């Protein structure tokens, strides 16, 4: 089997791997639709996770099960499934603590394109199929379903961490695909006013579609000053960080009111320290909670997000601005995430 | 002044009262729109809370401030306000515990038509105006605004108590006005599948409008078997009780899965005991949490729900099936709530 | 292999079974100390879980690993271990929801003396050793360690469910071994006043040792009136049910103040319905939360309770009023559990 | 009244007895205690410039006069006065954050926006909401630890979200940290690792439940704790002292999914550092909380029950007891010089 892989830092290319074999609890999946992510770019060209050699990229996929182990019971060859980006080992002490995202170590729940070959191949390996796969209903299109493995679960997690009360005012810092799902997530938690911060017009339109009531362009002035004018000095009840540099952490604390919550799902890939402003954090005593979490994975997380799409609570197809067909177009879609045109949100490659 | 009052258990009529006088922190409001509730029916004709004498009924009103105390700071005569059904004293020990609904004793946060003259009069008294009143934006119609004081905050409270996770399956037992707002609340908490139980078609249509994906009519068979068939034996993650007799508590426990939650906002006016089925409650060990709460009130609760209506997260005007004009039609609206025609959800009397 | 077994409903005795074989993830353990439970009595003489034939009884044991499967990684033959009473399958959807006690179905986390042979034999089988075993420190005596598998985790779970705030007043209804650990748990959650309800003097003395500040004997009058007099009408912030018939549920609701919590760990083995008093539950609106849960199990739960004993946070050896030596005295300890002398709390059998 | 004359200058002034509102009460102090906050206010300008402001915010006094609407307190009652006496009729109270009632940290009024307790009398706003009766069985030197030290340290333990048997590290074993050590024990902590150096504080930490002592004499705190937990880290870290860098140490020693609970007051620097890598680059589920201590009547009543029913003995914090109004100055000066055998000084006035 072939696979679009990271040869080394700054280099990508196709490689031939021996098709993987499933353990007694594992499954082999061929992809029906894949999507590249900004994480793949940070991994290859910035060394976000360190040095990697000959590692197939990609972690957002929808596929068909072709082979299962002798102990796999809920999945058989021919089943269309949604594969979460996080496929942890479910038999660790961190799972018994309630944090499967860190099963076996910090962020160790994320295996694809990290500690194992990713989904950008003719086949890929899923560990613990009965715990890390969810059946895909036929009524959900592939381009919509491939938004569930990473974009939907991450953005919604930012809304979960934000501890949104009914009618609260929420700010979403960054309206990329994750941020757009955070806006939709904030709406799904009963937020009243949703202030979205971003500039790209294609993102602003998608943000309004998902529930944003105000748009703050960080080109029209400082984010902090704009939001304080919108909220008439009250600030926001919660801020969801879905993009930006390390400085955006300071912006979030400044706009959240005392007792509120700063929920980060953004990946800070550079800098030794994330700044927390001393005065705006009450010198340590303002009850401004700061959370930061990896997206949940596993079967149950996927099944619940599938129900949200199935019952028309959120339509993630607005994230898909580019659709390609064919295994070869994985490279072009990946290079699109590196160039990042102003009309791109998320590209999807459809496979035979 | 005039006011539709409870003469005794089973008797209602107009009575003559002394126009109320405000304390230094209080406000006098004349009603602009009022709505009767089922609670008044349980109070008068079932003796659910005991004997009352010449107590003006009603607790759902949008009004105009006509007089304020010397220490009221945020409200002046002429301000259109939304008056929460629950107007507690905010300087008690129960408020410091986080349960203002029971400020001064069980259910003591609910004063109108309970321990104080209600809103069905030419004027009524609001205690602690700066803490128990919210300004009404011009953009919200009166017939919609009067759904906020009680119907919206109660139904949404059922959804809050239910501890709904994103994509969870929620059953709403009873789709009267409170149940319909519980359906809307469940959607606002990110519920996927929402199973609504009721029979009246006007309620069924409203349930579908507010987010119900399935309708269970308790005329077509036992509720438990229908819901267990719908969920393929899994049960529901949460059940919100918004109507029915004491037996509906047993129905809720039977359909909620182990680890789920039964959230009751229904007001049981008859029976000595609410039944909890032993076996289906795991003989005490199934982790099926049972909650039951009076609706939140106060200025902040009203302001947050106003933002939900203002930013078009929920449209409560669909609850209003009958609109009348005039003090005389308060009697007609109250009696409609006693007979409950098959086409009634919520009546509103406009006093423009 | 010898084993004390439930022959049928109402009959027990020693039988010879084929020594069990471990699966690749399992372990074979020989017991060093065991304890009978009230649950074993309900199973044999009341048919609580139905008819059983030649099922070895017992679920509280501390032992030595004698054999492990090829995939067990943290335990080798010779390791002294604490075996939790609940040894669930850790690869189910209920584990992903956070309720391992119901892994595979209601209460299905409890396997010993239910769906598999218990610990009252020369050897027993532990499923998923790396997830369901904890190492036993040498400094902890066997008679103390064998209180961890069930009594400590159940009683402490009652304290966890009660949502105890620092300085709150907690009542524990029933001071058997589980109730005594609920008293200790309430102290470990920062309870101020702890009112323990019981009659047997050996139980009263243990309750005082574990932190009880007041003793209510239900022979001196109704529990409700006694507790309301002690708290001067305030009631308690939480009530932990650790014993009694179904009527104790109504008693619990009557003494808890509005906004409090009723946390049940008791096993109700009789009655079709557990009564919840309508009026004292606020007619459904008193914010009196009712919880009821099976005890937590698994490796992490045992390791944490082991640390509580190791670092001298709780001494469970005071629960042990009878210690016998010898494999044969399992019969005497089990029968002692049925006769219930006034000086008995928990008996322990030491082996070899 | 012992007052802050200006930045760096203090002295006795004119006892202009305060007047109570209809809901307020005038209390004369029976026992007071100075805090590091009093020192930061005067000599570092922590809250800005003040003129003729009576200092002090930890006092157990007796109410001598009440307003016409005070119902639960009469002249002659011995009460515990919390350091935080917020206005209870604001929107932040309806959100559940009375410490910020009317603005960030606005729940703390004594020695901030009103004269403190180091005077012949002081003014307590909303007596029925900000006062608690003091049982006779509780000694004064023990009771005066409740208004600030006990409620702060216990708040650090509350914010930490401690599960039964969890491993908790307390960074800093001053009076607040010592109460955080006792608080973690009250929340069911198993192993409690205390970080500090002064011997009188180390002995108190073991008394309140600390199972390990990490001294910066044997190496960096991060390396020591990782060896103690054999690389597992701790489930929660309560920050009760140190510079801004202690925030980075806290993140490094807490395991993924744990909690950093800060009650420390950071008075210098523009930014508190959160280490990127050890915070999972933003995704390690290491929650960071930081809150002002709770106040009000209920908070005091709950902590009084803990002392009354002998759940915690705060008298071990009191290393020096003085008698007389004049020794308020000497006790205040101890907090500035900080002897190595001092934890908390108390001035008895009854
Ligand atoms: N926690 C998890 O499990 C998880 C999962 C997936 C991804 N992530 C990470 O979360 C982040 C989300 O990125 P993405 O997938 O949504 O694609 P993206 O296009 O890179 O998102 C960046 C968004 O933030 C905007 N932005 C840049 N700087 C900003 C600033 N100072 N303030 C406000 N907005 C700013 C960008 O607008 P402009 O075009 O003007 O720059 C854009 O709208 C990534 O870093 C990703 O690696 C985390
Ligand atoms: N917690 C609070 O603060 C608060 C506030 C306001 C009201 N309440 C109370 O909550 C309840 C809500 O009533 P409402 O105002 O929404 O008007 P409602 O029309 O009386 O609500 C009754 C609903 O329950 C249904 N019902 C009756 N018996 C049923 C059964 N065996 N099984 C299933 N459904 C059954 C009814 O079915 P049909 O469609 O056939 O009629 C209807 O859908 C009332 O008791 C009210 O007093 C509480
Ligand atoms: N949730 C779980 O996972 C779990 C685990 C283990 C056990 N359990 C069950 O929880 C219960 C705990 O029993 P145990 O192991 O602690 O032994 P136990 O000695 O049988 O406990 C009975 C206690 O409850 C008292 N009691 C009986 N009726 C009472 C009444 N009307 N009012 C007040 N107290 C009353 C008893 O009073 P006296 O002092 O007069 O006897 C005694 O103190 C058992 O039913 C057990 O099967 C549950
Ligand atoms: N959130 C609130 O409401 C509240 C209330 C009261 C006070 N506070 C503030 O919280 C802090 C608690 O201070 P305190 O009253 O308990 O007296 P303190 O003596 O100042 O407590 C400081 C503790 O931290 C130690 N320390 C200093 N640098 C350290 C470092 N790099 N690493 C580890 N430990 C270090 C100190 O050692 P030494 O023994 O050598 O000094 C001492 O043990 C103060 O800053 C206070 O202003 C907050
Ligand atoms: C950190 C990593 C988690 C899973 C997939 C995301 O894109 C990035
Ligand atoms: C009631 C029973 C359930 C599991 C734990 C022990 O076996 C007791
Ligand atoms: C900031 C200030 C709050 C109340 C009293 C404490 O000592 C410190
Ligand atoms: Cl496995
Ligand atoms: Cl006031
Ligand atoms: K907060
Ligand atoms: K489905
Ligand atoms: K539950
Ligand atoms: K508005
Ligand atoms: K409650
Ligand atoms: K140990
Ligand atoms: K956390
Ligand atoms: K007391
Ligand atoms: Zn991705
Ligand atoms: Zn009503
Ligand atoms: Zn047992
Ligand atoms: Zn202080």
d(CA A121, CA A53): 16
d(CA D34, CA D56): 6
- Extract the annotated binding site of D for NADP(+): 173-176, 196-198, 216, 263-265, 338
- Expt. technique: X-ray
Sign of the torsion formed by the C-alpha atoms of A326, A332, A338 and A340: negative
- Beta carbons within 8 Å of D329's beta carbon, 6+ residues apart: D2, D10, D12
d(CA C166, CA D299): 9
d(CA C224, CA C197): 11
Q: What is the DSSP letter of C317?
A: G
Q: Would you give the distance in Å from CA A257 to the centre of its chain? A: 27
Judged on CB neighbours under 10 Å (0-12, 13-18, 19+), A233 is exposed
Half-sphere exposure of C326 (CA within 13 A, CB side): 5
Nearest alpha-carbon partner for B39 in B20, B52, B28, B25: B52
Q: How wide is the angle at C-alpha C301 spanned by C-alphas C298 and C304, nearest 5°? A: 145
- Beta carbons within 8 Å of A17's beta carbon, 6+ residues apart: A1, A2, A3, A56, A117, A121
CATH of domain A152-292: 3.40.50.720
The 10 Å Cβ neighbour count of residue B214 is 18
Crossing angle for the helix pair C153-161 and C177-188, nearest 10 degrees?
50
Q: How big is chain B by its Cα radius of gyration, in Å?
A: 20
Q: What is the DSSP letter of A116?
A: B
Q: How wide is the angle at C-alpha A266 spanned by C-alphas A265 and A272, nearest 5°? A: 120
Segment (H or E) for A136: none
Number of A–C residue contacts, CB under 8 Å: 35
B55-56 and C2-8 as β-strands: parallel, antiparallel, unpaired? unpaired
d(CA B65, CA B78): 5
Q: Is the separation of the CB atoms in B158 and B290 below 8 Å?
A: no
d(CA D284, CA A99): 10
Answer whether A290 sits within 8 Å of D291, measured CB to CB: no
CA of D143 to the centre of ligand 7 (A): 17
Q: Is A272 on the interface with D (CB under 8 A)?
A: yes
| Resolution of the experimental structure, in angstroms | 2.2
Q: Is A90 on the interface with D (CB under 8 A)?
A: no
Q: Is the separation of the CB atoms in A126 and A149 below 8 Å?
A: no
Answer whether D284 sits within 8 Å of A107, measured CB to CB: yes
What are the Cα distances from residue C1, in Å, to C14, C75, C352, D249?
A: 10, 23, 16, 55
- Beta carbons within 8 Å of B210's beta carbon, 6+ residues apart: B180, B181, B183, B184, B187, B314, B318
What is the number of the ligand closest to the CA of B161?
Answer: 14
Match 């030595």 to its residue by tokens. C64
The 10 Å Cβ neighbour count of residue B328 is 11
Q: How big is chain C by its Cα radius of gyration, in Å?
A: 20
- Beta carbons within 8 Å of A221's beta carbon, 6+ residues apart: none
Q: Would you give the distance in Å from CA B236 to the centre of its chain? A: 24
Pull the structure tokens for residue B267.
């007001």
Judged on CB neighbours under 10 Å (0-12, 13-18, 19+), D342 is middle
Segment (H or E) for C18: none
- Beta carbons within 8 Å of A49's beta carbon, 6+ residues apart: A42, A43, A114
Collapsed DSSP state (helix, strand, coil) of residue B87: coil
- DSSP 3-state percent helix, strand, coil across chain D (nearest 5): 30, 25, 45
d(CA C189, CA C170): 10
Q: What is the DSSP letter of D150?
A: I
Q: Is B221 on the interface with C (CB under 8 A)?
A: no
What are the Cα distances from residue B134, in Å, to A284, B126, B138, D100?
A: 33, 12, 13, 21
Q: Is the separation of the CB atoms in A67 and A133 below 8 Å?
A: no
- Beta carbons within 8 Å of C125's beta carbon, 6+ residues apart: C20, C22, C26, C27, C28, C29, C116, C117
d(CA B218, CA B199): 7
d(CA D49, CA D38): 13
Q: How big is chain A by its Cα radius of gyration, in Å?
A: 20
Strand partners, B31: B63
- Beta carbons within 8 Å of D38's beta carbon, 6+ residues apart: D55, D56, D57, D111, D116, D332, D335
Half-sphere exposure of C170 (CA within 13 A, CB side): 37
Nearest alpha-carbon partner for A239 in A228, A229, A254: A254
Pull the structure tokens for residue A161.
């961490």
Q: Is A204 on the interface with D (CB under 8 A)?
A: no
Smallest Cα distance from A299 to chain C, Å: 8
d(CA B313, CA B330): 30
- Beta carbons within 8 Å of D167's beta carbon, 6+ residues apart: C307, D189, D190, D191, D192, D193, D229, D232, D234, D235, D236
Count of helix runs (H) and strand runs (E) in chain D: 11, 17
Nearest alpha-carbon partner for B284 in C116, C240, C227, C150: C240
CATH superfamily of D150-290: NAD(P)-binding Rossmann-like Domain (3.40.50.720)
Q: Own/partner pairs for D47-51, CB < 8 Å, 24+ apart?
A: D47/D112, D49/D6, D49/D7, D50/D4, D50/D6, D51/D4, D51/D5, D51/D6
Ligand 7 pocket test: pick from D83, D112, D144, D154 the residue with the most ligand atoms within 8 Å of its Cβ: D83
Q: Is the separation of the CB atoms in C96 and A84 below 8 Å?
A: no
Q: Is C285 on the interface with B (CB under 8 A)?
A: yes
Strand partners, B323: B348
Q: Is the separation of the CB atoms in B93 and B156 below 8 Å?
A: no
A55-56 and D234-239 as β-strands: parallel, antiparallel, unpaired? unpaired
Disruptive mutation site among B192, B305, B307 for chain A (greatest number of A CBs within 10 Å): B192
d(CA C60, CA C34): 6
Q: What is the DSSP letter of D110?
A: B
Segment (H or E) for D305: helix D296-308
The backbone torsions φ and ψ at residue C100, rounded to the nearest 5 degrees and listed phi first, read: -65, -25
Please report all neighbours of A, defined by 3+ CB atom pairs within 8 A: B, C, D
B27-35 and B346-350 as β-strands: parallel, antiparallel, unpaired? antiparallel
| Distance between start and end Cα atoms, chain C | 16
Nearest alpha-carbon partner for C173 in C148, C150, C199, C154: C199
Pull the structure tokens for residue D91.
């929107």
Disruptive mutation site among A107, A261, A285, A296 for chain D (greatest number of D CBs within 10 Å): A285
d(CA C281, CA C292): 17
Smallest Cα distance from D82 to chain B, Å: 14
Q: How big is chain D by its Cα radius of gyration, in Å?
A: 20
What are the Cα distances from residue A219, in Å, to A32, A57, A199, D291?
A: 40, 34, 7, 34
Nearest alpha-carbon partner for A297 in A95, A139, A136, A125: A95
d(CA C100, CA A100): 14
Q: Which residues is chain C interrupted after (C–N above 2.5 Å)?
A: none
Ligand 2 pocket test: pick from B45, B178, B239 the residue with the most ligand atoms within 8 Å of its Cβ: B178
Q: Would you give the distance in Å from CA A10 to the centre of its chain? A: 23
d(CA C233, CA C69): 59
Segment (H or E) for A180: helix A177-188
Match 């390996």 to its residue by tokens. A125
Q: Is the separation of the CB atoms in C48 and C109 below 8 Å?
A: no
Match 């979960």 to its residue by tokens. A160
Q: What is the DSSP letter of A294?
A: P
Strand partners, C67: C28
CA of D263 to the centre of ligand 21 (A): 12
Disruptive mutation site among A95, A243, A249, A273 for chain D (greatest number of D CBs within 10 Å): A273
d(CA C322, CA A249): 60
Nearest alpha-carbon partner for B126 in B146, B112, B136, B115: B112
B124-126 and C11-16 as β-strands: parallel, antiparallel, unpaired? unpaired
Nearest alpha-carbon partner for C301 in D163, D255, D209: D163
Answer whether D297 sits within 8 Å of B128, measured CB to CB: no
Nearest alpha-carbon partner for A218 in A193, A238, A245, A258: A245
Match 């295996």 to its residue by tokens. A111
What are the Cα distances from residue C87, in Å, to A324, C22, C118, C296?
A: 49, 15, 11, 9
The 10 Å Cβ neighbour count of residue C56 is 26
d(CA B196, CA B216): 6
Q: Is the separation of the CB atoms in B350 and B32 below 8 Å?
A: yes
Q: Is the separation of the CB atoms in B282 and B256 below 8 Å?
A: no
B236-241 and B170-173 as β-strands: parallel, antiparallel, unpaired? parallel
B60-68 and B27-35 as β-strands: parallel, antiparallel, unpaired? antiparallel
Q: Read out DSSP for A202-259?
A: HHHHHHHHHT-SEEE-TTSS-HHHHHHHHTTT--EEEEEE-S--THHHHHHHHHEEEE
Count of helix runs (H) and strand runs (E) in chain A: 11, 17
């Amino acid at each position: 089997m072939k696979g679009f892989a990271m040869l080394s830092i700054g280099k990508v290319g196709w490689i031939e791997k021996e098709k993987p074999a499933p353990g007694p609890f594992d499954a082999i999946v061929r992809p029906l639709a894949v999507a590249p992510c900004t994480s793949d770019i940070h991994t290859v060209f910035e060394g976000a996770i360190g040095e990697r050699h000959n590692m197939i990229l990609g972690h957002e996929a929808v596929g068909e099960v072709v082979e299962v182990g002798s102990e796999v019971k809920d999945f058989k060859p021919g089943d269309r499934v949604v594969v979460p980006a996080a496929t942890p080992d479910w038999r660790t002490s961190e799972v018994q603590r309630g944090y499967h995202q860190h099963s076996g170590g910090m962020l160790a729940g994320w295996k694809f394109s990290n500690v194992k070959d990713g989904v950008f191949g003719e086949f890929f390996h899923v560990n613990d199929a009965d715990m890390n796969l969810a059946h895909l209903p036929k009524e959900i299109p592939l381009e919509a379903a491939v938004m569930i493995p990473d974009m939907m679960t991450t953005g919604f997690h930012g809304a979960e961490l934000a501890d949104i009360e009914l009618g609260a005012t929420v700010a979403v810092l960054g309206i990329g695909p994750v941020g757009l799902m955070a806006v939709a997530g904030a709406k799904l938690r009963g937020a009243g006013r949703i202030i979205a911060v971003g500039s790209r017009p294609v993102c602003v339109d998608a943000a309004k579609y998902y529930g944003a009531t105000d748009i703050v362009n960080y080109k029209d002035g400082p984010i902090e000053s704009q939001i304080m004018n919108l909220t008439e000095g009250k600030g926001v009840d919660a801020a969801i960080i879905a993009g930006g540099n390390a400085d955006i952490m300071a912006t979030a604390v400044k706009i959240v009111k005392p007792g509120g919550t700063i929920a980060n799902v953004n990946y800070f890939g550079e800098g030794e320290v994330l700044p927390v402003p001393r005065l705006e954090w009450g010198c340590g005593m303002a009850h401004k909670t700061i959370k930061g979490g990896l997206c949940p994975g596993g079967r149950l997380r996927m099944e619940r997000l599938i129900d949200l799409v199935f019952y028309k609570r959120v339509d993630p197809s607005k994230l898909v601005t580019h659709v390609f067909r064919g295994f070869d177009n994985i490279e072009k879609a990946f290079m699109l995430m590196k160039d990042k045109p102003k009309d791109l949100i998320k590209p999807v490659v459809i496979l035979a």
